[PDB]
Amino acid sequence: QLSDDEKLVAAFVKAVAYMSPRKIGALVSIEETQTLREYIATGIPLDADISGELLINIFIPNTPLHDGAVIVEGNKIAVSCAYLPLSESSHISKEFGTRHRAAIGLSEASDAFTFVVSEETGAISVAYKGDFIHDLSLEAFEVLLREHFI
Amino acid sequence: QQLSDDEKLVAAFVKAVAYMSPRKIGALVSIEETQTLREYIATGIPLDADISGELLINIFIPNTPLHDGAVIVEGNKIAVSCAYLPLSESSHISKEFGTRHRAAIGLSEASDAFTFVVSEETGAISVAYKGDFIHDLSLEAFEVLLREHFI
Ligand SMILES: Nc1ncnc2c1ncn2[C@@H]1O[C@H](COP(=O)(O)O)[C@@H](O)[C@H]1O
Ligand SMILES: [Cl-]
Ligand SMILES: [Cl-]
Structure with a gap:
């Protein structure tokens, strides 16, 4: 649970470290106190353990799960x-x-806490509670995740 | 009355090979039957994921972290x-x-275990089950075998 939060952070960091320099677009949203049930209803059910590897495979361009x-x-x-x-x-x-x-x-x-990787530039960005943080470094992304989730 | 688990399994496998075979994407999928596969599952990366054709396809895309x-x-x-x-x-x-x-x-x-393979060299769909090996099934043959075995 505290270790689960550290695995979550490490998963997101591994995925963005792979996708950003390859300019693979990615869009990941994490539920907080407000249910995302209505948006979850629009997606393909995975109910999958979180890992950096699975997040990368999801977003590989031109694949069934990427869009x-x-x-x-x-x-x-x-x-x-x-x-x-x-x-x-x-x-x-x-x-x-x-x-x-x-x-x-x-x-x-x-x-919800959302991060994006730009498919045009590979820039990493965060959208949270109406603030938009553009073009984070991987180290800044990591520390922000740690502060927010650990 | 929603689609049974067995119907979803068959549909997932059929969708996956239908995509991977023409593209010659190699794939290797084993289904546990009565004998536990616990010692082999221990060697893999934990997914614990719902079965879909889409996920099976994304797993095996070449040159990705999960494909080997x-x-x-x-x-x-x-x-x-x-x-x-x-x-x-x-x-x-x-x-x-x-x-x-x-x-x-x-x-x-x-x-x-019931295992099927898609060859990366030819795209041929094959099955390995109880020591028998069945090479180059058609999509229809594959589906009917899956139904006779799993439904
Ligand atoms: N013992 C094994 N169990 C499962 N997959 C394997 C095993 N050995 C090799 N492979 C996979 O078989 C595919 C072809 O292997 P290779 O011909 O060495 O490239 C690759 O996806 C390998 O990771
Ligand atoms: Cl971005
Ligand atoms: Cl920054």
Whole structure:
């Protein structure tokens, strides 16, 4: 449980360390106090143990599980391919695509913690409670996850 | 009345090989029957995942972290990927058949598990069960065998 939180952080760090330098797009949302049941209902059920390796395999481009969001519930990957509400806010830079607007939209509609890897640039970003943090370093991503989840 | 576990299993396997065979994506999938596969499951990466054709496909995409080794199904879950199975020590195995096939055949000597393979060389779908090896099944043949065995 404390060790489960450290495995969660390590899984996310391994996945983003693989995907970011390969510019593999990724979108991962973690449930907090507000249920994500309605978005989980839109995805393919996995109910899978969390590991960096499984997160990488999910997001490999042009594969059946890659398109849409992974939603983490507790210590399980609940689903992949979930459809998240887009943000209609105009303050979103033009260069930020669908994945980023999906993450931002969920962070305006829930207290879920979402991170993105850009398929255009490999930039790592976080969307949480209406704040959007662009282009984190891997070390910064890790310490932010640790502070939030450990 | 929703689709039974057995119907979902058959559909998952059929969808997966239907995708991997034409693409010549190698695959190795073993299903536990009455004899526990616990010692082989211990060698794999824990997934404990719901069975879907989509997940099986994503596991075996070439040059990915989960694609090497065997997937082992236990009950209605994908227990592990990347598992090690016993390689067949037999010498009456054609030189056409590589290590995935020898692993499938080996496990079918050591247990009553049902294993199927997709060849990365030809895309051929094959089954290894109770020491017998059935090469190059059609998709229809594969499905009917799965139904006769699992339903
Ligand atoms: N003992 C084994 N059990 C399960 N899979 C294996 C085993 N040995 C090799 N493989 C896999 O068989 C495939 C072909 O092996 P190779 O011909 O050595 O490239 C690769 O995915 C290997 O990881
Ligand atoms: Cl980003
Ligand atoms: Cl930073």
